[PDB]
Structure formats: structure tokens, C-alpha cells
């Protein structure tokens, strides 16, 4: 029960989903042909939450892959771990938005939204009990942002009761892969604060930093970053698919991490992170993982938490451990970081423990921080957009695709309102 439907938009979303479903299949011991050959009944007891068992004991991922270009879908169908997908799921157009949010939300999206919603409704009726949706996309490409916003709007208009998760790759401050990404980022963020339950902002800057420094890799490819994000997601949901002395679900996290409906943006963090040689030079201690999770260099969002305060903190542990040890860690870390938390929330740590490790290691930990520093990030983006809107550069594309300047005005206004709210609540005593 409590099945979760996976949706992927944007090229980055598709690559992340490919690696993520690879990870999931490996965890449940599912071959690329889709047949289970594992040895632990635990995997099969909750396999339904992510898979569907077709006859002859075949298993298919409950996933949807969406784009507007055939290249990425063709690549996915080409490589291994692509056969198990239902071949009818690959919805794709022919043009590709081309970093034009208006195209990805007005013209092209209006063509494939019908098929997307049809497949979504089919999947919804196919499952027993719907828990929520998790979305994968970008915020720079027009495809990702535009179509993701459109689908989120339609779905929320169709399911006001379900919980919605989004893993949006926020563009990095220093490095920008595009030229016009501030516009679409602003519009997509507007729609997200409109109709989303939680957003896991992630930057390629922070991921590159972690891969280069912590993992000691001079050549980080997209595969490595996608693998990291996949591990993060699997750690997030594993409290559902496995027993634990203190389990959590998406609803519990949503209640714990969202004090007020607007402030629902998080940052993730994973531990441990060890190189190929630097692994047997350390004891795997709950204190070690705890201290690894809390530091500037290990945050997947390019924003120093020291510049702000933590509104809420959640932690999910995997592998056997004693609760008392974790409790001691939490109390010690809250004692030493007394200046790093909001005062009006006592005991702002939400703990949860599973009983299965991330295959190959003895224990692991995932940290989800809802802090206030992230607003700084937003600030910068607005400034970028601000400059790029003062001269109205590149405006004519969106203008001729139906959008108007009032749209950008309202989007910037809403973003500034959100930043003001975040700053004000940081200053709350």
C-alpha cells in the first residue's frame, strides 16, 4: 500500500531517474529483465510501493519519463536497465522547449499534457492506496521548469489531498550553464511556492565541491552526481519500504518540517562519504556520522547555514544502532549549536531509524535541513533577474510566446515576498 508514483521531467530529471531506478532495482535485487532473484522477503513485502508485478512474476517500475526530445528517451531505451520500463510510458514530443519557459508551459506542454495526465490517472487507478508523488526535473531548461510547473498545477488541481515532492536542481550561483535561466527559474519557483508541498533544492556547485574535495575525485562526471542524488532519495523513502525501531513516512516529515505553509524548502545531506582509500581509516560511529552531516562543506545547497538559523532538522538513519547513542548525539549537537536554531522551537530535531543499510556499508545517515540561509540564494537569483529585466534582454521570445511583462513583475514580487517572510521569521524570537 501507500504506493508512490514517480514522474521525471527535463533531461536532468530523466538521467537522475535512470540512475535512481538502477539503485532501487539493485536494492531490491531486481534484474534488468524485471524478475526478482533476491533472498530477503523484506524486499518483496513492500516491493509494491514502487513496483507493479505483472504476470509470470515480472516487475515493472511505477515511473513516468517525460520530455519533448527523442534523444534522451532513445538513450534510455538503448542502455541496460531500460527494458523493465513499460514501453508505453515514454511520453516525448519532437521539438524540445529550448530554455523557453513559455514554450514548455504554453505551447508544447499543452500538446502532451493530455497523454501525461491520462497515464497518470491510469497509474493512480492501478494502485491500491496513493501516498504521494515525487518529481524530478531541473529549473534551468525550459522543458523541465515549464512542463513540471504545468503538470504540478494540473495534478494538484486533481488531487488536493496527496503529498507532492520535488527535487529541483536549482542553478548554481557562480556557474551558469545557460544565459536566460533566471527568468524560467523565477517563474517555476513562483509556481512551486503556489502548488508544492516540499522542494529539495540542489545545486551542481555544491555537488561538484563535495565530489572533488570529500570524495577526492578530479574528474566528476554527471553519473556521480546523479548517483549521489539517487542515494539521497532512496535514503529518504527507505523508512517506508523497510521496518525500523522508529519509522517515518512522507506525511510525518511534511508535518514536522513545515511550521508554516510557505516555508517548505529543504536541503539534503548524506553520510558517510569516504574515498576508495580513506574508508578503513575511520570508525563508523553515530557521532561520526552526526558530525559529518553538520558542516558547511557537506551541504548540497550553496548556502552557509551559519549565515542563518535552522528552522527544523530531520534525520533518517540506516543500519543497526542504539537509540540512546543517537539521542546523546542530538542533545550534544543542539547544546553546542545553541545559536544556530530558532528560539521559539524547543527540540527541533526529528529522528527516524530504519533497520537496513544502503548495501555495502554498515550504517548511513541522511539529514534534511529546513533553514533560513537559503533565502540568500534566492536574493542573488532575483538580482540576476533584476538586471536582466532592467534591459528586458531576451524578453521578445517570451513576449511572442504569449507571456507578458506583468508575469515577470508578479513573479519577482512573489519571490521578494517569500524572501521577506523567510528573513522575518529568522528574526523571530
Amino acid at each position: 500500500m501507500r504506493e508512490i508514483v514517480h514522474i521525471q521531467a527535463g533531461q536532468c530529471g530523466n538521467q537522475i531517474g535512470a540512475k535512481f531506478w538502477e539503485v532501487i532495482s539493485d536494492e531490491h535485487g531486481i534484474d534488468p529483465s524485471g524478475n526478482y532473484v533476491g533472498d530477503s522477503d523484506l524486499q518483496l513485502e513492500r516491493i509494491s510501493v514502487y513496483y507493479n508485478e505483472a504476470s509470470s512474476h515480472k516487475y515493472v517500475p511505477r515511473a513516468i519519463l517525460v520530455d519533448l526530445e527523442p534523444g534522451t528517451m532513445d538513450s534510455v531505451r538503448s542502455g541496460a536497465f531500460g527494458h523493465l520500463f513499460r514501453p508505453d510510458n515514454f511520453i516525448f514530443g519532437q521539438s524540445g522547449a529550448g530554455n523557453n519557459w513559455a514554450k514548455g508551459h504554453y505551447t508544447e506542454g499543452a500538446e502532451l499534457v493530455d497523454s501525461v495526465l491520462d497515464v497518470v490517472r491510469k497509474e493512480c487507478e492501478n494502485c491500491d492506496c496513493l501516498q504521494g508523488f515525487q518529481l524530478t526535473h531541473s529549473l534551468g531548461g525550459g522543458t523541465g521548469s515549464g512542463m513540471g510547473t504545468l503538470l504540478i498545477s494540473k495534478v494538484r488541481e486533481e488531487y488536493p489531498d496527496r503529498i507532492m515532492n520535488t527535487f529541483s536542481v536549482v542553478p548554481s550561483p557562480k556557474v551558469s550553464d545557460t544565459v536566460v535561466e533566471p527568468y524560467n527559474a523565477t517563474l517555476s519557483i513562483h509556481q512551486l511556492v503556489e502548488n508544492t508541498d516540499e522542494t529539495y533544492c540542489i545545486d551542481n556547485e555544491a555537488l561538484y565541491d563535495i565530489c572533488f574535495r570529500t570524495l577526492k575525485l578530479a574528474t566528476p562526471t554527471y553519473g556521480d552526481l546523479n548517483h549521489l542524488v539517487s542515494a539521497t532519495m532512496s535514503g529518504v523513502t527507505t523508512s517506508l519500504r523497510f521496518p525500523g525501531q522508529l519509522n517515518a513516512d512522507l506525511r510525518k516529515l511534511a508535518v514536522n518540517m513545515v511550521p508554516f505553509p510557505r516555508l517548505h524548502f529543504f536541503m539534503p545531506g548524506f553520510a558517510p562519504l569516504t574515498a576508495r582509500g580513506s574508508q578503513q581509516y575511520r570508525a563508523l560511529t553515530v557521532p561520526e556520522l552526526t558530525q559529518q552531516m553538520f558542516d558547511a562543506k557537506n551541504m548540497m545547497a550553496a548556502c552557509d547555514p551559519r549565515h542563518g538559523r535552522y528552522l527544523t532538522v530531520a534525520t533518517v538513519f540506516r543500519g543497526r544502532m542504539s537509540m540512546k547513542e543517537v539521542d546523546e548525539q542530538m542533545l550534544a549537537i543542539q547544546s553546542k549549536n545553541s545559536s544556530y536554531f530558532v528560539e521559539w522551537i524547543p527540540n527541533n530535531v526529528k529522528v527516524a531509524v530504519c533497520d537496513i543499510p544502503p548495501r555495502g556499508l554498515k550504517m548511513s545517515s541522511t539529514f534534511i535541513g529546513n533553514s533560513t540561509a537559503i533565502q540568500e540564494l534566492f536574493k542573488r537569483i532575483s538580482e540576476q533577474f533584476t538586471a536582466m529585466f532592467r534591459r528586458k534582454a531576451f524578453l521578445h521570445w517570451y513576449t511572442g510566446e504569449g507571456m507578458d511583462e506583468m508575469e515577470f513583475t508578479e513573479a519577482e514580487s512573489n519571490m521578494n515576498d517569500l524572501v521577506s517572510e523567510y528573513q522575518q521569521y529568522q528574526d523571530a524570537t
Partner: protein, 432 residues
């Protein structure tokens, strides 16, 4: 699924297309007989047999060049349907190629274009190759581009225009042809690529150590540029890019769409070793003004937008590091109102050396498309020349007797001044 068609006006266009289709055949492993002892679906259609034909269109008024193409090695490859020929060339007279002679076959060319379009489903755009000096070039380009823009409302349209060199000229009335054709194409061209023969001469002589280069080598270089531009469509990459992405990322304003192209690496075969060809190294080679293919030093202007297409085994992390370092430099300065002026594309297919060529095979290559304000200066020079050759009303009588008005010259000059003014005005910074 994603098709893009080619048009070649004048001898320059035809030779450039010879080089281009030669290169494409070498890429997809295509015999001169359409056999290959999907990828090619973009540019090649397939007959019932295993033979493929290129979606190409050749047009000229002098039949000599087309006859050479027919008698050339690439005879069996082309479809003799498209090799349109005339009787008398425009003869460096825009009036002939735009009012008198071009009318004779404009309908035929349009018909061939429409027939090719109807058999394609993923029509992307048009690659027009044409010089500016030749009257065929200017006149037929103006006519055909007007017709196509009239027909198809919004589809990609790319030109590879051979801008006349500042000092090294071949014709005499080049300013007239250039001014008229630019005034025409300013309203229809989605995105035009300036290329000059003098810059390529300099590049080949200094960097490839070829003391006496022929037109063949310049055609090789331009074919390399075009192949690198389309490699994102024709293949898969860690981060692909389409032409609509280019037009969205390089056109801040509807009129300013005149970038220039640069390519790297370019080293002699004997110099294949003696350097490791770093991604940062090739980045520096690209951004060095001695390698830009238009006679304009970018240090006199600001890069309004830049795009980099890498092909071969590249890694985005080091690419991003090199780009960030480039941004930290001073002389490479952009507009204040643009915070980031870089677009990045990556393809897994390395370029392939042309057999019988002059370059050396590499594992990584990079094409740069830059839309800056330095190029504006170039226009002024031509106007200068035009003004002198228009002050004495020299050579005007040919055009007058061919059905053209002096007011056309005056209005074209005014429009050129307006474009230059817009370029300079955008070149300024913003208030507060």
C-alpha cells in the same frame, strides 16, 4: 525526425557545400554512392535501396560550377533534380540577381524547396551558404530568403555569409552588393554567421604553417565549423543543444543576431605532439583574438553572448572551471546588465580528420559562437567605402538600367546607420 536543409548560392556557396557534404559523408561513413559499409536521418534521406541522398539544393546562374560538381567525384551522390543552373551569371550586379535574372528560376527553386519540405517531418531550418561580393550571392539570397520567410512563418534560418575583407578585395562593387544584401537580410535572417577570407588566410598561414593556402582549405575550415554546430543534433551528448536554444541564448534583441565563429584546435600534423591539448588550453585558443574568423579585435568591444560547443571526451567539471577562470579576466568584459554570457554544449562524437587534408586528428574540439559589439565597427568600414563610391555616383547606371532606384541605395545606407547606432547604443552600460 529532425531535418535541416541546405541551400548554396554562387560559386562560394557551391564550393562550401562541396566541402560540407564531403565532411558529412566522411562522418556517417557514407560512400560517394549513398552506401554505408538513426544518425544520418537528419541530413540524408534513404531510397528503397541502401543508397542515401543528401537533402541539398544547389543554385547558380553560371553552369560551369555545377558542371564541375557533376563531373566531380561526388557525382553519383547528389540527386540531379536539385542541381539548378541558369544561363548568365548576375555578374556582381545585385540588380540582375534580384530583379531580372533571379525571377527566371526563383519559382523552380521554391518548388524544389517545398517538395523537399513535404517529404520531411522534423524540418528544423535552412542553412544558406553564399558570399556577398558576387551579384548572384546578394541578389539570389535576398530573393530566396524573402520568399522562404514569406512562406514559412517561424522556422530556423541560418546563413554563412562571406563578409568582404577590409582590404583584400576581389571585385570592385562589393560595397554595393554587401550593403543591399545586408539591408535585405536584416529583417529575414534569424541568425547569420560572418566569415571573412582574410582572417582564414591569416589563420592557415600562421597556425597551420601553410604559406600558400587555396580556397579548398578555407572550405575545409568552414565545413568543420558547420559540422561542429550540428553535431549536437546529429549525435548524443551529455548536454546537447538545438538551434532554437542558440537563438534564445544569443539574441538579446530582435535585430542584433550577427555572431562570428571560431574553431579550435588548429595545429599542423607535425605539431600533433608537443602539447597535450587541455580543455583550458583549447578554451584559451578559442578566446584568443588571433583565432577569430572576422577581422575585428574583440578587445574594442564587449561580448554580449558566447556559446561553446565541445565534442569528444570532455568533462563538465573542468569545462566549468576553465570558463569560470575566463570570467575572472578583465579584458574579456561583457555588458553590466548581463550577469552570465555563456552557453555550453557537449557531444560525445569527436571530429574526424578529412582524408587528404591539412589538419591533424584530435580527441576534443570546440567551436565558439560569439555575439559581440566589436563586429559593429566592421559595418562602418563598408559604409565608408560605399559612401565614397556613392559620392561620385559611380557604377550606378548599371543598376539604374536594371530596374533599381537611387532611393534604394539611400534607404539601405540609412538602415545600415540605424543598425550601427543600435549596436553602439546597446554596447553602452545601464543606469544604476
Amino acid at each position: 525526425m529532425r531535418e535541416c536543409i541546405s541551400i548554396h548560392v554562387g560559386q562560394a556557396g557551391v564550393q562550401i557545400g562541396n566541402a560540407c557534404w564531403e565532411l558529412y559523408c566522411l562522418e556517417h561513413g557514407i560512400q560517394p554512392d549513398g552506401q554505408m559499409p538513426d544518425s544520418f536521418n537528419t541530413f540524408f534521406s534513404e531510397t528503397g535501396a541502401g543508397k542515401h541522398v543528401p537533402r541539398a539544393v544547389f543554385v547558380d546562374l553560371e553552369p560551369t560550377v555545377i558542371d564541375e560538381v557533376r563531373t566531380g567525384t561526388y557525382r553519383q551522390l547528389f540527386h540531379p533534380e536539385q542541381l539548378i543552373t541558369g544561363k548568365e551569371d548576375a555578374a556582381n550586379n545585385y540588380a540582375r540577381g534580384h530583379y531580372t535574372i533571379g525571377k527566371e528560376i526563383i519559382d523552380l527553386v521554391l518548388d524544389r524547396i517545398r517538395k523537399l519540405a513535404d517529404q520531411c517531418t522534423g524540418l528544423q531550418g535552412f542553412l544558406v551558404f553564399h558570399s556577398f561580393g558576387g551579384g548572384t550571392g546578394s541578389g539570389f539570397t535576398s530573393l530566396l530568403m524573402e520568399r522562404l520567410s514569406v512562406d514559412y512563418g517561424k522556422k530556423s534560418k541560418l546563413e554563412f555569409s562571406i563578409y568582404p575583407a577590409p582590404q583584400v578585395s576581389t571585385a570592385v562593387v562589393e560595397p554595393y552588393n554587401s550593403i543591399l544584401t545586408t539591408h535585405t537580410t536584416l529583417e529575414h535572417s534569424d541568425c547569420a554567421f560572418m566569415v571573412d577570407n582574410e582572417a582564414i588566410y591569416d589563420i592557415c598561414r600562421r597556425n597551420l604553417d601553410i604559406e600558400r593556402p587555396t580556397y579548398t582549405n578555407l572550405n575545409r575550415l568552414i565545413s568543420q565549423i558547420v559540422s561542429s554546430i550540428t553535431a549536437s543534433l546529429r549525435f548524443d551528448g551529455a548536454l546537447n543543444v538545438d538551434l532554437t536554444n542558440f537563438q534564445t541564448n544569443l539574441v538579446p534583441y530582435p535585430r542584433i543576431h550577427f555572431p562570428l565563429a571560431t574553431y579550435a584546435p588548429v595545429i599542423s600534423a607535425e605539431k600533433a605532439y608537443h602539447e597535450q591539448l587541455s580543455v583550458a588550453e583549447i578554451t584559451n585558443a578559442c578566446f584568443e583574438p588571433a583565432n577569430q574568423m572576422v577581422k575585428c579585435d574583440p578587445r574594442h568591444g564587449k561580448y554580449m553572448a558566447c556559446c561553446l560547443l565541445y565534442r569528444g571526451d570532455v568533462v563538465p567539471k573542468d569545462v566549468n572551471a576553465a570558463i569560470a577562470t575566463i570570467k575572472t579576466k578583465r579584458s574579456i568584459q561583457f555588458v553590466d546588465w548581463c550577469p552570465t554570457g555563456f552557453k555550453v554544449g557537449i557531444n560525445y562524437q569527436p571530429p574526424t580528420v578529412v582524408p587528404g587534408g591539412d589538419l591533424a586528428k584530435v580527441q576534443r574540439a570546440v567551436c565558439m559562437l560569439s555575439n559581440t559589439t566589436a563586429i559593429a565597427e566592421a559595418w562602418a568600414r563598408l559604409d565608408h567605402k560605399f559612401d565614397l563610391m556613392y559620392a561620385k555616383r559611380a557604377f550606378v547606371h548599371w543598376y539604374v538600367g536594371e530596374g533599381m532606384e537611387e532611393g534604394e541605395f539611400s534607404e539601405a545606407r540609412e538602415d545600415m546607420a540605424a543598425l550601427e547606432k543600435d549596436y553602439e547604443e546597446v554596447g553602452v552600460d545601464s543606469v544604476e
